[PDB]
Design an enzyme around this catalytic site. Structure first.
Site, PDB file in Angstrom:
ATOM      1  N   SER A  13       5.518   8.292   2.568  1.00  0.00           N
ATOM      2  CA  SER A  13       6.519   8.228   3.626  1.00  0.00           C
ATOM      3  C   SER A  13       7.751   7.426   3.231  1.00  0.00           C
ATOM      4  O   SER A  13       8.690   7.338   4.030  1.00  0.00           O
ATOM      5  CB  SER A  13       5.899   7.643   4.897  1.00  0.00           C
ATOM      6  N   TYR A  68       8.033   3.208  11.109  1.00  0.00           N
ATOM      7  CA  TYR A  68       7.133   2.949   9.994  1.00  0.00           C
ATOM      8  C   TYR A  68       7.765   3.266   8.642  1.00  0.00           C
ATOM      9  O   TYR A  68       7.713   2.439   7.726  1.00  0.00           O
ATOM     10  CB  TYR A  68       5.844   3.756  10.175  1.00  0.00           C
ATOM     11  N   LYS A 113       8.345   1.187   4.656  1.00  0.00           N
ATOM     12  CA  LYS A 113       7.809   1.597   3.363  1.00  0.00           C
ATOM     13  C   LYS A 113       8.920   1.946   2.382  1.00  0.00           C
ATOM     14  O   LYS A 113       8.836   1.599   1.198  1.00  0.00           O
ATOM     15  CB  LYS A 113       6.851   2.774   3.546  1.00  0.00           C
TER      16      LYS A 113
HETATM   17  N1  LIG Z   1      -4.411   5.114   5.126  1.00  0.00           N
HETATM   18  C1  LIG Z   1      -3.492   5.993   4.451  1.00  0.00           C
HETATM   19  O1  LIG Z   1      -3.731   7.127   4.329  1.00  0.00           O
HETATM   20  C2  LIG Z   1      -2.165   5.447   3.880  1.00  0.00           C
HETATM   21  C3  LIG Z   1      -1.292   6.335   3.320  1.00  0.00           C
HETATM   22  C4  LIG Z   1      -0.127   5.911   2.810  1.00  0.00           C
HETATM   23  C5  LIG Z   1       0.181   4.549   2.863  1.00  0.00           C
HETATM   24  N2  LIG Z   1      -0.685   3.653   3.427  1.00  0.00           N
HETATM   25  C6  LIG Z   1      -0.299   2.216   3.452  1.00  0.00           C
HETATM   26  O2  LIG Z   1      -1.006   1.541   2.580  1.00  0.00           O
HETATM   27  C7  LIG Z   1      -1.668   0.278   3.324  1.00  0.00           C
HETATM   28  C8  LIG Z   1      -3.185   0.306   3.092  1.00  0.00           C
HETATM   29  O3  LIG Z   1      -3.728   1.526   3.679  1.00  0.00           O
HETATM   30  P1  LIG Z   1      -5.111   1.401   4.605  1.00  0.00           P
HETATM   31  O4  LIG Z   1      -5.382   2.694   5.268  1.00  0.00           O
HETATM   32  O5  LIG Z   1      -6.280   1.019   3.695  1.00  0.00           O
HETATM   33  O6  LIG Z   1      -4.896   0.255   5.722  1.00  0.00           O
HETATM   34  P2  LIG Z   1      -6.158  -0.417   6.600  1.00  0.00           P
HETATM   35  O7  LIG Z   1      -7.234  -0.990   5.626  1.00  0.00           O
HETATM   36  O8  LIG Z   1      -6.768   0.621   7.446  1.00  0.00           O
HETATM   37  O9  LIG Z   1      -5.571  -1.630   7.548  1.00  0.00           O
HETATM   38  C9  LIG Z   1      -4.541  -2.467   7.010  1.00  0.00           C
HETATM   39  C10 LIG Z   1      -5.141  -3.522   6.041  1.00  0.00           C
HETATM   40  O10 LIG Z   1      -4.169  -4.740   5.964  1.00  0.00           O
HETATM   41  C11 LIG Z   1      -4.699  -5.739   7.038  1.00  0.00           C
HETATM   42  N3  LIG Z   1      -3.700  -6.001   8.116  1.00  0.00           N
HETATM   43  C12 LIG Z   1      -3.172  -5.410   9.193  1.00  0.00           C
HETATM   44  N4  LIG Z   1      -2.315  -6.301   9.720  1.00  0.00           N
HETATM   45  C13 LIG Z   1      -2.341  -7.434   8.956  1.00  0.00           C
HETATM   46  C14 LIG Z   1      -1.659  -8.635   9.060  1.00  0.00           C
HETATM   47  N5  LIG Z   1      -0.671  -9.303   9.896  1.00  0.00           N
HETATM   48  N6  LIG Z   1      -1.875  -9.602   8.160  1.00  0.00           N
HETATM   49  C15 LIG Z   1      -2.759  -9.411   7.143  1.00  0.00           C
HETATM   50  N7  LIG Z   1      -3.422  -8.241   7.038  1.00  0.00           N
HETATM   51  C16 LIG Z   1      -3.206  -7.253   7.959  1.00  0.00           C
HETATM   52  C17 LIG Z   1      -5.680  -5.141   7.605  1.00  0.00           C
HETATM   53  O11 LIG Z   1      -6.730  -6.081   8.057  1.00  0.00           O
HETATM   54  P3  LIG Z   1      -7.246  -7.412   7.116  1.00  0.00           P
HETATM   55  O12 LIG Z   1      -6.104  -8.350   6.794  1.00  0.00           O
HETATM   56  O13 LIG Z   1      -8.257  -8.175   7.893  1.00  0.00           O
HETATM   57  O14 LIG Z   1      -7.851  -6.913   5.814  1.00  0.00           O
HETATM   58  C18 LIG Z   1      -6.223  -4.008   6.520  1.00  0.00           C
HETATM   59  O15 LIG Z   1      -7.016  -4.624   5.466  1.00  0.00           O
HETATM   60  C19 LIG Z   1      -1.423   0.360   4.612  1.00  0.00           C
HETATM   61  O16 LIG Z   1      -0.690  -0.877   5.085  1.00  0.00           O
HETATM   62  C20 LIG Z   1      -0.547   1.598   4.841  1.00  0.00           C
HETATM   63  O17 LIG Z   1       0.631   1.224   5.391  1.00  0.00           O
HETATM   64  C21 LIG Z   1      -1.855   4.079   3.937  1.00  0.00           C
END
Ligand SMILES: NC(=O)c1ccc[n+]([C@@H]2O[C@H](COP(=O)([O-])OP(=O)(O)OC[C@H]3O[C@@H](n4cnc5c(N)ncnc54)[C@H](OP(=O)(O)O)[C@@H]3O)[C@@H](O)[C@H]2O)c1
Ligand SMILES: NC(=O)c1ccc[n+]([C@@H]2O[C@H](COP(=O)([O-])OP(=O)(O)OC[C@H]3O[C@@H](n4cnc5c(N)ncnc54)[C@H](OP(=O)(O)O)[C@@H]3O)[C@@H](O)[C@H]2O)c1
Ligand SMILES: NC(=O)c1ccc[n+]([C@@H]2O[C@H](COP(=O)([O-])OP(=O)(O)OC[C@H]3O[C@@H](n4cnc5c(N)ncnc54)[C@H](OP(=O)(O)O)[C@@H]3O)[C@@H](O)[C@H]2O)c1
Ligand SMILES: NC(=O)c1ccc[n+]([C@@H]2O[C@H](COP(=O)([O-])OP(=O)(O)OC[C@H]3O[C@@H](n4cnc5c(N)ncnc54)[C@H](OP(=O)(O)O)[C@@H]3O)[C@@H](O)[C@H]2O)c1
Lengths: 256, 247, 256, 247
Positions: D148, D159, D163
């Site tokens: 994205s 969002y 990114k």
């Molecule tokens: N899921 C997808 O398909 C996808 C695709 C493209 C990009 N992304 C990006 O890549 C990142 C990782 O993906 P994901 O799906 O694996 O995310 P996720 O694990 O489902 O949740 C976000 C992670 O960062 C922590 N988080 C949320 N808010 C926080 C805050 N203030 N402070 C510290 N930690 C916080 C979360 O909890 P904890 O801190 O307790 O660990 C979690 O470990 C994401 O931030 C997302 O934006 C994801």
């Protein structure tokens, strides 16, 4: 009045995008060289557009020049200087797109697509630029590329490298021709309903699936490209060179 | 001829790029809302432009509306409908670029930069898009980003994310606003105006000159007009070839 | 290690980036087809690298295949299968960059550059993809493009479109060869100090001025590309296809 | 092993990509600092990963550090040097993605989104980058961005700029930190699965399968290693071909 008394060469201007871009250029005051492939169909279309351009007080000529033939660049320049006195804008639009799978792609189809879409365009741009530099009055070069210059196409392993190469040629040409006031840009059309899409458009199911991908909610028409080509050729874009411009209704950014 | 009977809101339209766009939009036949930061310089420049636009037969007002204050968008939209009864184009141009090194960047300067350049633009776009949708006649939104949305800058670690953020916003909003006929695009200016340093920057521009604020008027008016009715989600470099000139 | 029991074809592996990449894959447990153009200098370099690969227990053969000759790709795959039983990775690296101005570009120089850098790569990629699909165990393809695929060069009007076309070929081949487990990617090196640009590095003022523009503060060396190339051909890049990767020390983003 | 003796900090490392990346670095010989959000579940996940890391002979610690709290950057850095005496790699992964339509986007939802994804990442990067310069032994920084960063999302208008801005942050910091041997790069994951619609989403991936957290650990450990000694200011799509496959 954006191109008054200017000479505009549009290759592949007997149908589709080139035809509507050659019309709007004459509507902006330009004398247009309507380049076509040399076939009997392209001669019928180029001379048909000429009748329409003269019908609203314009002036244009039809010139046959196969893009694959590397001589065609000097042929279009010569016929443009002889009829109108100069060459001021080149709209490089001629190109083919024979869809075909990659692993069984015949060699002669690949070279035919590269020779027409990129090779002939190179020396057509060079011959137009050479005339522009000699005149000392600057000029504009617009290459009709495609959205496929940024993304892939399974049935287009032979086609998208020529569109991406066409975009990259405008970038390097902008640096080379910059010191002579020659601007070189590319428009990237999305999904335009044209003569290449005849068989696919009649199927209503495919057309809705194609339309659903476009945030504006419709497929493109040749007139949708005419504006951005006249813009990039105009004084409105006097500081725009080495740039690309998507004309796709938001197709590229609409990730599902 | 390109913007007859359209209402255009230009933020940061008292100096530089926004001023020249607002003037050109008025020449094209538009009712222009001239926006400024509310400082003395911004209010004085907005008046002088409204004086010039009125002198050649234009129609314009001057509204102060700090881009950091997330309320300004609705303030300018209310001021626009109150005067002209429509909102059809938004040119989000306001922004600051305070150069500063990275490893000692204070929180105050960063938050002001992101708040002015991106956070305020979001809700300014939201406000203008809300009126365009309820009108039901379409509209155009142009964000003045920068060539720095594609590359970096050592003294702009806080600045280039807002430029690239502005470009991303135009991509997403073009999805969410396409069904309402609202096109969204981003213009990317290059270097727009130590004489030994001035020519060294000019040495890198293939066109051989730095840009002027009027070099951005044409591209902005084209994107807001029917000449670009199928153009949304796009970016347009206006830099004289600076980006492609690798060396 | 990363490439055990794997056969890697590396075109243009006698010198520069290809030589460093082929040596590294052999260090990762692969059996390397060292491709060269057939010249006496190229054959000597391909043999020199094979003797070095044998020195540390590796296995590699040297095969001459003129990239400008469109029949060479099928001869490269045949030599690999006959000697090693499989084709698992293809590193398309052969290429040239004869610097030349645009307006007086000879036809021979443009066609030689496009035919070598892009046309020969297309059918070398086709022949290698054909074998990979036939084997039914997936594969990896890596095209050595350039930072010149994203920007221009006034002396590279003919060269940058072949680099932009290589990137885009990888994008379109990722879609076509996706269902067969073949990953296709492209590395975009910056200014690596090799024989392709040695004359500019023969000058100390030009060498130090170019280094100024790289944030990491040094020009590239051929080994700087071996790591990224082996990463993309290994299981580390399990989910990586149709991507590009800059290896330029930060040259691209450092706006001057 | 590529990360032996290196100290790595991973924000948001209790679930998804951050957890898989933190474990994979430990398996590469790194002393991991498992940062988390301080929530109830977040501390549970971060503490269970540290026992799993210790179970196979690794060395990891857990540190609560709300990414929205700009104090977290120096808290993780101080906790890393107290525990391991060094800071060598930063994997900034923490972030949120609350899908929400644009025209009624609440102001506080946007502010939490940008504050966590971009602003909090900014000063986490700064805190790690200052320690890397103080040691004078180089370093690497990886920002987990997204596909994205290049395309739009109608329900992600708040969002995608975060990114896209994280990419722009690595580009500029690459310049500003290049002279100190600090490399900065970004990974751009696709649909990482962390059933009627699940089939249609797979049909758009040329590799033919959705993503998993481990699919991102290889790219991350590569960018953090000596295999990328000449890679800075770069971005790597890890999406199984989703970006390039138009239609
Ligand atoms: N899921 C997808 O398909 C996808 C695709 C493209 C990009 N992304 C990006 O890549 C990142 C990782 O993906 P994901 O799906 O694996 O995310 P996720 O694990 O489902 O949740 C976000 C992670 O960062 C922590 N988080 C949320 N808010 C926080 C805050 N203030 N402070 C510290 N930690 C916080 C979360 O909890 P904890 O801190 O307790 O660990 C979690 O470990 C994401 O931030 C997302 O934006 C994801
Ligand atoms: N239609 C789309 O959806 C779309 C999308 C993206 C990009 N494009 C590109 O934009 C260009 C215009 O496409 P279109 O919509 O107008 O449909 P089109 O039927 O492909 O028109 C292409 C024009 O090039 C001419 N042509 C073919 N071979 C030629 C040769 N040796 N010499 C000279 N001209 C030759 C064609 O015939 P004439 O010479 O008789 O004029 C035609 O006028 C094309 O190059 C296409 O690749 C199109
Ligand atoms: N000029 C260049 O070379 C260049 C390069 C890259 C990008 N840009 C973009 O161009 C835009 C304007 O820059 P410029 O070249 O025109 O220089 P400028 O002369 O300083 O113009 C700044 C304008 O933005 C407004 N502004 C700044 N902070 C504001 C705030 N809190 N609230 C409301 N308005 C504020 C100002 O309104 P007031 O009059 O009330 O102060 C002013 O009209 C910026 O958004 C920048 O991103 C310019
Ligand atoms: N070096 C850089 O700075 C740089 C920057 C951007 C991109 N690149 C790309 O990286 C690739 C290699 O560059 P380089 O630095 O390694 O240059 P190099 O030192 O001159 O090596 C070029 C290799 O390509 C082979 N070659 C040339 N023409 C060939 C032909 N018809 N058939 C087969 N092989 C042929 C050569 O084999 P022979 O020994 O037989 O001649 C040689 O091994 C090129 O594709 C180039 O475009 C390089």
């Amino acid at each position: 009045s954006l191109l008054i008394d200017k000479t505009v060469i549009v290759t592949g201007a007997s149908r589709g995008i080139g035809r509507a871009a050659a019309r709007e250029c004459a509507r902006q005051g330009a004398r247009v060289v309507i380049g076509h492939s040399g076939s009997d169909e392209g001669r019928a279309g180029a001379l048909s557009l000429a009748e329409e351009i003269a019908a609203f007080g314009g002036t244009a000529i039809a010139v046959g020049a196969d893009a694959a033939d590397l001589d065609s660049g000097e042929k279009l320049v010569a016929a443009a200087v002889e009829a109108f006195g100069s060459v001021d804008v080149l709209v490089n639009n001629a190109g083919i797109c024979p869809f075909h799978s990659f692993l069984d792609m015949p060699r002669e189809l690949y070279l035919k697509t590269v020779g027409t879409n990129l090779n002939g365009a190179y020396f057509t741009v060079q011959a137009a630029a050479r005339r522009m530099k000699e005149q000392g009055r600057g000029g504009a070069i617009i290459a009709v590329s495609s959205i496929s210059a940024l993304v892939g196409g399974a049935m287009q392993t032979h086609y998208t490298p020529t569109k991406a190469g066409l975009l990259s040629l405008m970038q390097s040409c902008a640096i080379a021709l910059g010191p002579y006031g020659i601007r070189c840009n590319a428009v990237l059309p999305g999904t335009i309903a044209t003569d290449i899409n005849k068989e696919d458009l009649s199927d209503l199911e495919k057309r809705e699936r194609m339309t659903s991908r476009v945030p504006l909610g419709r497929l493109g028409e040749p007139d949708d490209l005419a504006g951005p080509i006249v813009f990039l050729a105009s004084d409105m874009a006097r500081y725009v060179t080495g740039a690309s411009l998507l004309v796709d209704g938001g197709l590229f950014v609409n990730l599902q």
